[PDB]
Design an enzyme around this catalytic site. Structure first.
Site, PDB file in Angstrom:
ATOM      1  N   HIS A 224       3.895  -2.400  -7.527  1.00 10.66           N
ATOM      2  CA  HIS A 224       3.211  -3.552  -6.950  1.00 10.66           C
ATOM      3  C   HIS A 224       2.009  -3.135  -6.094  1.00 10.66           C
ATOM      4  O   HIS A 224       1.182  -3.995  -5.860  1.00 10.66           O
ATOM      5  CB  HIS A 224       4.129  -4.504  -6.128  1.00 10.66           C
ATOM      6  CG  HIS A 224       5.063  -3.852  -5.147  1.00 10.66           C
ATOM      7  ND1 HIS A 224       6.370  -3.444  -5.516  1.00 10.66           N
ATOM      8  CD2 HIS A 224       4.965  -3.616  -3.800  1.00 10.66           C
ATOM      9  CE1 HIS A 224       6.986  -2.905  -4.471  1.00 10.66           C
ATOM     10  NE2 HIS A 224       6.134  -2.994  -3.402  1.00 10.66           N
TER      11      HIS A 224
ATOM     12  N   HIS B 133      -0.342   0.529   2.616  1.00  9.38           N
ATOM     13  CA  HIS B 133      -0.540   0.160   1.215  1.00  9.38           C
ATOM     14  C   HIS B 133      -1.650  -0.869   1.135  1.00  9.38           C
ATOM     15  O   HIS B 133      -2.257  -1.259   2.156  1.00  9.38           O
ATOM     16  CB  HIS B 133       0.769  -0.344   0.667  1.00  9.38           C
ATOM     17  CG  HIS B 133       1.169  -1.576   1.397  1.00  9.38           C
ATOM     18  ND1 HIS B 133       2.047  -1.505   2.475  1.00  9.38           N
ATOM     19  CD2 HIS B 133       0.773  -2.851   1.264  1.00  9.38           C
ATOM     20  CE1 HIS B 133       2.162  -2.721   3.014  1.00  9.38           C
ATOM     21  NE2 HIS B 133       1.401  -3.613   2.269  1.00  9.38           N
TER      22      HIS B 133
ATOM     23  N   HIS C  49      -3.779  -4.259  -1.020  1.00  3.78           N
ATOM     24  CA  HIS C  49      -3.800  -5.494  -1.825  1.00  3.78           C
ATOM     25  C   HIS C  49      -5.242  -5.716  -2.265  1.00  3.78           C
ATOM     26  O   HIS C  49      -6.180  -5.669  -1.468  1.00  3.78           O
ATOM     27  CB  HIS C  49      -3.324  -6.685  -0.944  1.00  3.78           C
ATOM     28  CG  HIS C  49      -1.947  -6.450  -0.374  1.00  3.78           C
ATOM     29  ND1 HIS C  49      -0.811  -6.830  -1.078  1.00  3.78           N
ATOM     30  CD2 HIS C  49      -1.524  -5.921   0.813  1.00  3.78           C
ATOM     31  CE1 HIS C  49       0.285  -6.508  -0.392  1.00  3.78           C
ATOM     32  NE2 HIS C  49      -0.128  -5.949   0.797  1.00  3.78           N
TER      33      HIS C  49
ATOM     34  N   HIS D 147      -2.816  -2.372   4.660  1.00  4.75           N
ATOM     35  CA  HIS D 147      -1.807  -2.710   5.665  1.00  4.75           C
ATOM     36  C   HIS D 147      -1.208  -1.420   6.179  1.00  4.75           C
ATOM     37  O   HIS D 147      -0.589  -0.691   5.401  1.00  4.75           O
ATOM     38  CB  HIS D 147      -0.700  -3.570   5.042  1.00  4.75           C
ATOM     39  CG  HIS D 147      -1.164  -4.979   4.852  1.00  4.75           C
ATOM     40  ND1 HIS D 147      -0.544  -5.854   3.957  1.00  4.75           N
ATOM     41  CD2 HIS D 147      -2.190  -5.648   5.434  1.00  4.75           C
ATOM     42  CE1 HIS D 147      -1.149  -7.018   4.029  1.00  4.75           C
ATOM     43  NE2 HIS D 147      -2.175  -6.928   4.888  1.00  4.75           N
TER      44      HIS D 147
ATOM     45  N   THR E  53       4.756  -9.703   3.703  1.00  5.56           N
ATOM     46  CA  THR E  53       4.115 -10.556   2.683  1.00  5.56           C
ATOM     47  C   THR E  53       4.671 -10.305   1.297  1.00  5.56           C
ATOM     48  O   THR E  53       4.139 -10.890   0.354  1.00  5.56           O
ATOM     49  CB  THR E  53       2.581 -10.377   2.634  1.00  5.56           C
ATOM     50  OG1 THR E  53       2.354  -9.061   2.137  1.00  5.56           O
ATOM     51  CG2 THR E  53       1.885 -10.569   3.968  1.00  5.56           C
ATOM     52  N   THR E  54       5.734  -9.511   1.203  1.00 10.81           N
ATOM     53  CA  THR E  54       6.507  -9.407  -0.034  1.00 10.81           C
ATOM     54  C   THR E  54       7.976  -9.682   0.264  1.00 10.81           C
ATOM     55  O   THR E  54       8.413  -9.556   1.416  1.00 10.81           O
ATOM     56  CB  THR E  54       6.319  -8.042  -0.700  1.00 10.81           C
ATOM     57  OG1 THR E  54       6.641  -7.002   0.240  1.00 10.81           O
ATOM     58  CG2 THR E  54       4.887  -7.853  -1.158  1.00 10.81           C
TER      59      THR E  54
HETATM   60  N1  LIG Z   1       2.653  -6.421   2.867  1.00  8.53           N
HETATM   61  S1  LIG Z   1       3.334  -6.126   4.305  1.00  8.53           S
HETATM   62  O1  LIG Z   1       2.457  -5.255   5.016  1.00  8.53           O
HETATM   63  O2  LIG Z   1       3.634  -7.386   4.876  1.00  8.53           O
HETATM   64  C1  LIG Z   1       4.839  -5.232   4.049  1.00  8.53           C
HETATM   65  C2  LIG Z   1       5.772  -5.638   3.102  1.00  8.53           C
HETATM   66  C3  LIG Z   1       6.945  -4.899   2.952  1.00  8.53           C
HETATM   67  C4  LIG Z   1       7.185  -3.773   3.752  1.00  8.53           C
HETATM   68  N2  LIG Z   1       8.375  -3.000   3.632  1.00  8.53           N
HETATM   69  C5  LIG Z   1       8.834  -1.788   4.031  1.00  8.53           C
HETATM   70 SE1  LIG Z   1       7.966  -0.589   5.126  1.00  8.53          SE
HETATM   71  N3  LIG Z   1      10.073  -1.422   3.615  1.00  8.53           N
HETATM   72  C6  LIG Z   1      10.812  -0.227   3.868  1.00  8.53           C
HETATM   73  C7  LIG Z   1      10.253   0.880   4.506  1.00  8.53           C
HETATM   74  C8  LIG Z   1      11.064   1.895   4.998  1.00  8.53           C
HETATM   75  C9  LIG Z   1      12.425   1.778   4.837  1.00  8.53           C
HETATM   76  F1  LIG Z   1      13.246   2.620   5.560  1.00  8.53           F
HETATM   77  C10 LIG Z   1      13.002   0.760   4.120  1.00  8.53           C
HETATM   78  C11 LIG Z   1      12.184  -0.246   3.624  1.00  8.53           C
HETATM   79  C12 LIG Z   1       6.238  -3.389   4.690  1.00  8.53           C
HETATM   80  C13 LIG Z   1       5.070  -4.115   4.841  1.00  8.53           C
HETATM   81 ZN   LIG Z   2       0.940  -5.466   2.570  1.00 13.48          ZN
END
Ligand SMILES: NS(=O)(=O)c1ccc(NC(=[Se])Nc2ccc(F)cc2)cc1
Ligand SMILES: [Zn+2]
Ligand SMILES: *[C@@H]1O[C@H](CO)[C@@H](O)[C@H](O)[C@H]1NC(C)=O
Ligand SMILES: *[C@@H]1O[C@H](CO)[C@@H](O)[C@H](O)[C@H]1NC(C)=O
Length: 276
Positions: free
Chosen positions: A65, A94, A96, A119, A208-209
């Site tokens: 993604h 990451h 978008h 982000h 946002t995911t």
């Molecule tokens: N687009 S966003 O920036 O809203 C965004 C969306 C999803 C998100 N998820 C993370 Se960092 N998950 C994860 C990381 C470490 C872990 F130990 C386990 C799970 C972060 C940012």
């Molecule tokens: Zn993001």
């Protein structure tokens, strides 16, 4: 499962497939409206800083993604209060972006979409011991949004890709999910210096995911950093994961959410900061 481009699993379905919390009233992204927002002179310049003792490698993955840079623990930090005492620790960055140059960002500023929004995701180490403890807990996360805009005339050294060190050339059609590669570290301090770190919107919102957890302190800088058309097209060479209808990765942004949907039980306010 979820996607951006398959109608059956796409963003309009997330409120049903992931009620907790994509059905909530504090969702992101939003339209950042300069006129509607409250200037808060107490909100200070943001600082990004590095532990110079850290030597572990940075990696990047095509997770199907986005292109996601994973930073080693205990290495990069954010301060919102001028003190360098490790209150927020950066986890990953990451991006978008759009199929075309006139869209791609998740947030808008006064209705305007940028080609690429990055982000930088951190956790509130001040309270929580690890990313995995913070990611699902109240007030666990703070994300910085960096807008990028395309310019035709610019030296490489003045583009965001100097800070990114071109992601060591990994953005290409062969970087298939879920491949990851070691890359040169990203100089996030240099990246932040390419914009005004005092001039930003600030609000409480969500990932946002899916699962869209409502535990993110958002900071979105108003001034963009600069890239070229060549650099945006590099991201467009990545392939989407097999969850997606579209082959090449693009339009990996969630639609705009309202600041205050009609069912809210306690309105939130959009704040803005500027230098002292
Ligand atoms: N687009 S966003 O920036 O809203 C965004 C969306 C999803 C998100 N998820 C993370 Se960092 N998950 C994860 C990381 C470490 C872990 F130990 C386990 C799970 C972060 C940012
Ligand atoms: Zn993001
Ligand atoms: C800085 O890095 C060193 C070396 O990896 C580590 O032992 C130390 O705890 C880190 N500091 C912080 C504040 O995370
Ligand atoms: C990164 O990419 C640009 C475009 O080819 C190039 O000019 C620059 O020298 C590269 N940076 C390095 C040397 O890592």
């Amino acid at each position: 499962e979820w996607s951006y481009t398959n109608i059956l699993t796409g963003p309009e379905t997330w409120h049903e497939h992931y009620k907790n919390m994509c059905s909530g009233y504090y969702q992101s992204p939003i339209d950042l409206k300069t006129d509607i927002s409250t200037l808060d002179l107490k909100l200070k310049t943001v600082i990004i800083y590095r532990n110079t003792s850290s030597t572990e490698t940075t990696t990047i993955q095509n997770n199907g993604h986005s292109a996601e840079v994973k930073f080693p623990r205990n290495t990069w930090f954010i301060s919102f209060d001028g003190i360098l005492d490790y209150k927020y620790e950066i986890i990953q960055m990451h991006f978008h972006w759009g199929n075309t140059d006139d869209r791609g960002s998740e947030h808008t500023i006064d209705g305007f979409r940028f080609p690429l929004e990055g982000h930088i995701v951190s956790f509130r180490r001040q309270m929580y011991s690890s990313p995995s403890e913070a990611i699902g807990r109240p007030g666990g996360l703070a994300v910085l949004g960096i807008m990028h805009q395309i310019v035709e005339s610019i030296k490489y050294e003045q583009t965001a890709f100097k800070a990114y060190n071109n992601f060591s050339g990994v953005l290409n059609s062969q970087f298939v999910p879920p491949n990851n590669s070691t890359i040169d570290d990203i100089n996030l301090a240099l990246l932040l210096s390419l914009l005004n770190p005092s001039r930003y919107f600030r609000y409480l919102g969500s990932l946002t995911t899916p699962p869209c957890t409502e535990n993110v302190l958002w900071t979105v800088f108003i001034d963009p950093v600069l890239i070229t058309r060549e650099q945006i097209n590099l991201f467009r060479n990545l392939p989407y994961g097999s969850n997606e209808k579209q082959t090449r990765m693009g339009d990996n942004f969630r639609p705009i959410q309202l600041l205050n949907p009609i069912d809210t039980l306690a309105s939130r306010t959009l704040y803005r900061a500027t230098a002292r």
